[PDB]
Design a protein around this ligand. Structure first.
Ligand code: HEM
Ligand SMILES: C[As](C)(=O)[O-]
Ligand SMILES: [Ca+2]
Ligand SMILES: [Ca+2]
Ligand SMILES: [Fe+3]
Ligand SMILES: [Fe+3]
Ligand SMILES: [Fe+3]
Ligand SMILES: [Fe+3]
Ligand SMILES: [Fe+3]
Ligand SMILES: [Zn+2]
Ligand SMILES: [Zn+2]
Ligand SMILES: [Zn+2]
Ligand SMILES: [Zn+2]
Ligand SMILES: [Zn+2]
Ligand SMILES: [Zn+2]
Ligand SMILES: [Zn+2]
Ligand SMILES: [Zn+2]
Length: 319
C-alpha cells in the first residue's frame, strides 16, 4: 500500500502510523537518538505489559499504565515511571491510536534508533484498557531469582526468555535505585544495543558508584555503572547463568531473541490474529558499533564464571 505522502507499508491501515513516527522521533526521541526517552519508553513497555496474571488479573499490554496512571504510577515497583507516562500522554491524546498501541509503538521505534538494535514486530489495534493492573506484578531488583522467574513464568515467560528480555538492560539506566547518582547506566554503552551488559554484570564487583546501602543494588565493576542485585543474581544463579553467558559476544542471538520475546511481551493480553501487522513501519536500526570487550585494565580473571558446562569466552580489553 502507498500512503498519502508516498511512503509504503504492506497493510493500508498502518499508514496512520507515519505521522506518529515522525512526531515521536523528533519530539520524544530528540531527533531519533537512543537516549533517555528511548530507555524510559522501553521500560514502559514492560511495566505496561507485565501487569498480566491469570490468577490476579490485569490486561497486559493494554495501555493501563497510562489510562489508570493515578493508580499504577504509585505502585512501588513503578517508581520513576510517572515521568515517561506524563511525557507520552499528550502524544496519545493528539494522535488517534490507543494507549496500548502507542506504548508498544514508541518502544519499538525507540529501540530501532540504537546501534545494534532490532525491529520489534509491531501490531496495531489494541482496544483501550478496561482495568488497572494489580500491584505486585512488576519484578523488583531486590527480588530473588525464584521470585522473578515465578512472576515472569506466571505471565508466560520461561527462564531463557527472561534472560533474552534483559538484553534491554544494555540500553538502560537507573534514577531511583541510588538517587544520588541518577542516570547511571547498567552497561558502559547505554546508547548501543550490544552484549556489554552480559559481560559487565559477570565481572567481580568492586565499588558502589554512589552510596553503599541501597536496597536492590550490588557492587559495580566500574565507577560509571550501576549493578542491580537481580542482575547480579541472574548472571550467577544455576538456572540462568548458562543462558546469560551465551549472550556474550553473540550479537545475532541477542538480536533474534530480544525481538521475538519483545513481540511476545507486547502481545500479552492481546490476540495477534485480531490486530494488523505494521512491523514494516519501524525504522531500520543501525549496525552495531564496537565489539565485545572487557574494560580497560581488566582480564579474564576478573570474570566470575558461572556456567559449569562452558567456559567464559576469551575477550580482548579496551586499550
Ligand atoms: C526481570 C526483572 C527486571 C527487574 C528486576 C528490573 C529492574 C529495573 C530497575 C530497578 C530499573 C531502574 C529503575 C530506576 O531506578 O530508574 C530498570 C530500568 C530499566 N528496565 Fe529493567 N528490570 C527487569 C526487567 C526488564 C525488562 C523485561 C525490560 C524490557 C523492556 C526492562 C527494561 C528496562 C529499561 C530499558 C530500563 C531503563 C530505564 C531508564 O533508563 O530510565 N527491564 N529495570
Ligand atoms: C510478588 As512481587 C513481583 O511484588 O515481589
Ligand atoms: Ca498494562
Ligand atoms: Ca549497551
Ligand atoms: Fe490519568
Ligand atoms: Fe482512543
Ligand atoms: Fe479511546
Ligand atoms: Fe527519571
Ligand atoms: Fe569499553
Ligand atoms: Zn531528551
Ligand atoms: Zn527521564
Ligand atoms: Zn524522561
Ligand atoms: Zn495523528
Ligand atoms: Zn510485591
Ligand atoms: Zn518483590
Ligand atoms: Zn531514566
Ligand atoms: Zn536459584
Amino acid at each position: 500500500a502507498t500512503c498519502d505522502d508516498g511512503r509504503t507499508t504492506a497493510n493500508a491501515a498502518c499508514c496512520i502510523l507515519f505521522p506518529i513516527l515522525d512526531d515521536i522521533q523528533e519530539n520524544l526521541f530528540d531527533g531519533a537518538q537512543c537516549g533517555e526517552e528511548v530507555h524510559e519508553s522501553l521500560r514502559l513497555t514492560f511495566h505496561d505489559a507485565i501487569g498480566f496474571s491469570p490468577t490476579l488479573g490485569g490486561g497486559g499490554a493494554d495501555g493501563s499504565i497510562i489510562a489508570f496512571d493515578t493508580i499504577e504510577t504509585n505502585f512501588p515497583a513503578n517508581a520513576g515511571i510517572d515521568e515517561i507516562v506524563s511525557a507520552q500522554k499528550p502524544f496519545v491524546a493528539k494522535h488517534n491510536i490507543s494507549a496500548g498501541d502507542f506504548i508498544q509503538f514508541a518502544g519499538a521505534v525507540g529501540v530501532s534508533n540504537c546501534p545494534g538494535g532490532v525491529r520489534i514486530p509491531f501490531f496495531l489495534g489494541r482496544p483501550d484498557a478496561v482495568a488497572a493492573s494489580p500491584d505486585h506484578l512488576v519484578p523488583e531488583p531486590f527480588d530473588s531469582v525464584d521470585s522473578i522467574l515465578a512472576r515472569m513464568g506466571d505471565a508466560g515467560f520461561s527462564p531463557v526468555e527472561v534472560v533474552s528480555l534483559l538484553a534491554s538492560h544494555s540500553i538502560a539506566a537507573a534514577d531511583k535505585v541510588d538517587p544520588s547518582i541518577p542516570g547511571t547506566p547498567f552497561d558502559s554503552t547505554p546508547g548501543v544495543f550490544d552484549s556489554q551488559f552480559f559481560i559487565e554484570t559477570q565481572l567481580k564487583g568492586r565499588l558502589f558508584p554512589g552510596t553503599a546501602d541501597n536496597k536492590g543494588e550490588a557492587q559495580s565493576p566500574l565507577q560509571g555503572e550501576i549493578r542491580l542485585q537481580s542482575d547480579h543474581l541472574l548472571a550467577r544463579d544455576p538456572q540462568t547463568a548458562c543462558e546469560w553467558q551465551s549472550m556474550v559476544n553473540n550479537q545475532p542471538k541477542i538480536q533474534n531473541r530480544f525481538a521475538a520475546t519483545m513481540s511476545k511481551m507486547a502481545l500479552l493480553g492481546q490476540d495477534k490474529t485480531k490486530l494488523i501487522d505494521c512491523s514494516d513501519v519501524i525504522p531500520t536500526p543501525p549496525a552495531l558499533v564496537g565489539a565485545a570487550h572487557l574494560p580497560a585494565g581488566f582480564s579474564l580473571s576478573d570474570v566470575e564464571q558461572a556456567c559449569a558446562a562452558t567456559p567464559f569466552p576469551a575477550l580482548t580489553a579496551d586499550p
